[PDB]
Design a protein around this ligand. Sequence first.
Ligand code: ATR
Ligand code: 6PG
Ligand code: 6PG
Lengths: 467, 467
Amino acid sequence: SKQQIGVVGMAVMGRNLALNIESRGYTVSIFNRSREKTEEVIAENPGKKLVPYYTVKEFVESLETPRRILLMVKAGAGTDAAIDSLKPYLDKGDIIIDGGNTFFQDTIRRNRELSAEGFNFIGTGVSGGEEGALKGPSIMPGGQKEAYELVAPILTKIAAVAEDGEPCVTYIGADGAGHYVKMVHNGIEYGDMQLIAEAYSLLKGGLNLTNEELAQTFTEWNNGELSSYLIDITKDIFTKKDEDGNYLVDVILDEAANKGTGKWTSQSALDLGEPLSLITESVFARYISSLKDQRVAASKVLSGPQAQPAGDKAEFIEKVRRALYLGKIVSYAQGFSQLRAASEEYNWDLNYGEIAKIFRAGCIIRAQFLQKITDAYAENPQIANLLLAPYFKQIADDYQQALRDVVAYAVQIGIPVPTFSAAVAYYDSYRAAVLPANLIQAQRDYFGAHTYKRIDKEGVFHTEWLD
Amino acid sequence: SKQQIGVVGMAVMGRNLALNIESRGYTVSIFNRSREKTEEVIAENPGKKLVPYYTVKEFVESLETPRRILLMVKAGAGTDAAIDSLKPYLDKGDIIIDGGNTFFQDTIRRNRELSAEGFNFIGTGVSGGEEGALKGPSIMPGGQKEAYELVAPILTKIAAVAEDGEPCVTYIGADGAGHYVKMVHNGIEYGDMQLIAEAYSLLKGGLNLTNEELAQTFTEWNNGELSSYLIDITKDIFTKKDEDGNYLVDVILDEAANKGTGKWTSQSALDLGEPLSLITESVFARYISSLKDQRVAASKVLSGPQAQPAGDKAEFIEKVRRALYLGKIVSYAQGFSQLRAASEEYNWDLNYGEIAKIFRAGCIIRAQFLQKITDAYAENPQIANLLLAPYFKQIADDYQQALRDVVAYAVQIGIPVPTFSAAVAYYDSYRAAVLPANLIQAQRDYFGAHTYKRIDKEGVFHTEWLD
Ligand SMILES: Nc1ncnc2c1ncn2[C@@H]1O[C@H](COP(=O)(O)OP(=O)(O)O)[C@@H](O)[C@H]1OP(=O)(O)O
Ligand SMILES: O=C(O)[C@H](O)[C@@H](O)[C@H](O)[C@H](O)COP(=O)(O)O
Ligand SMILES: O=C(O)[C@H](O)[C@@H](O)[C@H](O)[C@H](O)COP(=O)(O)O
């Protein structure tokens, strides 16, 4: 009469996680505030050991104790409400897993409150989209280690598994560390999508490639070092047609929506002093695509440059391919530097190689690329930035000229390349022993008496630039 | 008897503001938490109609009702501390004016709390530095309009004055609007400083100009449309020599510090959906300059390109000049669009032309340029973005090729130009009727069933991409 695990939230990720758990042999109670979505999941999944509940009291009473309840609810108010609804019905010792894309500070507060109340809480990221939620996602749990150990067996059962046999779940760290890692996974995902979008813009605008030629190009890139789930699905998207014979990609409205995690990643870079330019420009690229009416009006009044020969087709395709791969390297180097800054600030002692390992399969950014990062940290766990690791440093040596060529060409012909150009600016600033910030410090001392330090003597200084 | 106004906080900013007020013919009451700073100001200004108090009670009683108290203490808990110490002595209707560098949400909270208690609260920005606070700053107040009008006689007399005779102070809007506009002013200032730093980088690294040639160039640029206070002080900086007599700008550590406002501007753009790329990359350029140890390490490991010829000296200098001016236009277009988005979110009904007018003098970004923005809003107050105004469209028509040439050259030779790059990517995205966000929306629907809209049919769609 009782089920083993309960799942609250029957939208895409939640219903698929419930089906994932059930597929491992577990009996599962489900509940959704919009009671009609619960009905639908039951109707669509005859033969599965899912049992629907239509009041929170009955859902909670239906579970074996100590209870294991997974919440997959909308971030913010919604998750706070679901948790507050469950609370009066729970027993001390019950286990609450918030698997939603919750902002990490909310998880730090909740972990403190619920732990004090006697519950075992885990705030965990879950990554993999609809298919990954169903078949095996990457899971990144944070909270007290004792609470993790109570749910590790089930999380291991439903998680994706890498080619080497290792489950794509591991204890991330205390309190909000798991949701913070999920937030950065999503920021990295926004950057990978924007990098691919710029490659698409360059190949379509510079070479006038057709959608079949774009599909072909992405298929070839997917057979090499750029292989990844995002490139693999992009190759498919370019040949998808609607019932009318229209290529779907050309009738989809170009307003990219966002549900908060990329924005939060950039707001955290700003709080932590990390120069996270690529992912941030990817968020702003979504924002400006979301000003479609303004862009359509401006396109009718603002001038641009004339067309420019891209040159040999094969030569251009290889330069864009190299630019995309080096752009990814820069984005990940920025993202992982931010994980170390956050780890230091929030006292998480994150294990960067272990994080990269659980992103090898399951998650949206999965790609053999994550193994190159795992290996870099295995050789030097304290590495300050991935650009210094031999593998990455040598790709930058080999591919930076292609990236520079692509950015110069795009700027001359008018194709926007925010992330390829942020990648060049970051590479050339990170390797610069001296930047023009000496002038900025002089200006600040002149107009605001902010003082400055010198390269040849100790102390703080203030000058009368006037007299 | 009694003073029309008192100033709390006798550090440089508050004491200088009190002196500005006294110089206008007013008798000013002053008070500081540490009596010694007060005694100092008193001892230092013999003939000044400054009246010291050493108890908060006496200070408050010295003032004519409705009381006007200008609070210039450390932002944060110290401002709440100064507020909390004044309350018991205040009468309904009195006015507290916070001129600190306060985050606007704190001003919203205080304005609400104090209003409930019957007290007015004006959060005001003050721009111009130590000299400006003394001779004439730009003042940006928000709060109750009636309280502002009561104290406006005094503020209009201490403010800087524009070329048309108008004082650089105006009612900005309700609650936190003044502190929000001061924040944006500071984000714009960060952008102007970074654009100037890139121009310096390029002229020094590309043409090998000496500091004397840099001063000469900036002096020539300041005679024309670029005329601005920041360019004026930059040419002074380039010829300032040391004790020994070496150029001071060359011995300053290239680590740019910050006091929060730039970071705050970018975090607000992220909250509001505004693609504020230029100012945000200016903040990240300060962050990477502050990772000096990492940059020095990386400079010993990472490779870069071989320097290419810049060509004709005069021609290159003119291209950099044009790039700098068009970059400023783009940065201000982004900043004013953010002001419009904030005005809509926080219900301020901001008057953009009036905000541009009080930035014509007193403030750090003062420049003749602000009159072109003022003119644009006089003709079209609700214009969506400054790039659409005839004057700016024409500059972009004429100068974009130089900006493209400068970015392409910098990328080929390895000098980082994050804001010139962001300027070109924004211009080319804002004018693009169609962006590659159609592919981003397809990917999100493919992996997460996030749905999409179409350009040829109304409604919301989802595709089963796997079948
Ligand atoms: N206050 C609340 N209490 C409980 N569940 C809530 C909630 N607010 C949102 N959710 C759940 O959070 C899940 C995701 O909501 P959403 O609006 O973010 O969905 P989507 O992004 O897929 O359109 C849904 O299961 C939603 O329940 P409903 O289907 O009833 O909307
Ligand atoms: O890791 C994942 O499985 C995805 O990221 C998932 O969490 C979800 O699809 C997000 O909503 C995508 O982020 P944006 O909706 O904000 O595009
Ligand atoms: O308008 C002004 O008078 C300045 O902008 C002023 O507010 C101060 O000098 C800031 O501290 C500079 O900002 P940073 O210190 O963050 O560079």
